[PDB]
Amino acid sequence: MTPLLELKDIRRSYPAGDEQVEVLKGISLDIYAGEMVAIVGASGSGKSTLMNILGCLDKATSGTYRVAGQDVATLDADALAQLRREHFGFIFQRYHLLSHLTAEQNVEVPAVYAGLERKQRLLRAQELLQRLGLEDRTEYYPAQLSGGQQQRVSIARALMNGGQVILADEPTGALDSHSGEEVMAILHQLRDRGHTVIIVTHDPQVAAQAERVIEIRDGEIVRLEHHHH
């Protein structure tokens, strides 16, 4: 089809006088709407820097990145943030919840910066927590919730502005196996409903649940593999 995200010759280095340290060394990759892709590699491989570029939280040194047709290098910080909110939701190994906000209040947060009014933010945040199986927990503080529950809150939060593309960094890394499998089934279900899910992981067993696997070694794509379930 036509791709949702397009990367061509993406490079990233951190300046150190005139020895650059090269973290990404020319990555070309296309990602489509409605698929699950895993990026797999050891620590220091560049996978996390690649994620941050996908999410528009970092800028490539060179190369081209387009999101739904729009080249990100042309945009100022306000326009980029807006683009980010139109397309992306984020989850991590840690839950990144504010301890003194309820689950619902936590979910609402990203919509604040989309200009969304409080009555409307509240409604949508409750709908998403219900979808995630937490209808009874909307007023619980994170201290009162398990790890598994906290991650479901983080997923709802990732959908608040749409979450067309979910970027997930090692989302089961801090979870027992049952909670891990719940999270993965939720991600498969979002993909079935048309979301793109991108998972970064050091673990090839987590990666094997995706439709495509990209292996990164020393800042380069070393292998690309298709899977089916």
Helix (H) or strand (E) holding 88: strand 88-91
Instruction: Report resolution in angstroms.
Output: 2.3
Strand, helix or coil at 221?
A: strand
Half-sphere exposure of 20 toward its Cβ, with a 13 Å CA cutoff?
9
| Annotated binding-site residue? 180 | no
41 labeled binding residue: yes
Q: Where are the domains of the chain?
A: 1-229
Determine if residue 17 is labeled as part of a ligand binding site: no
* 48 labeled binding residue: yes
Classify domain 1-229 at the CATH class level. alpha beta
In angstroms, the CA 43 to CA 219 distance is: 11
C-beta separation of 12 from 49 below 8 A: yes
42 labeled binding residue: yes
What CA–CA distances, in Å, run from 31 to 28, 84, 92, 97? 10, 16, 20, 29
User: What is d(CA 171, CA 191) in angstroms, rounded to the nearest whole number?
Assistant: 16
The answer to whether 28 is annotated as binding is no
Residue 212 CB neighbours (<10 A): 17
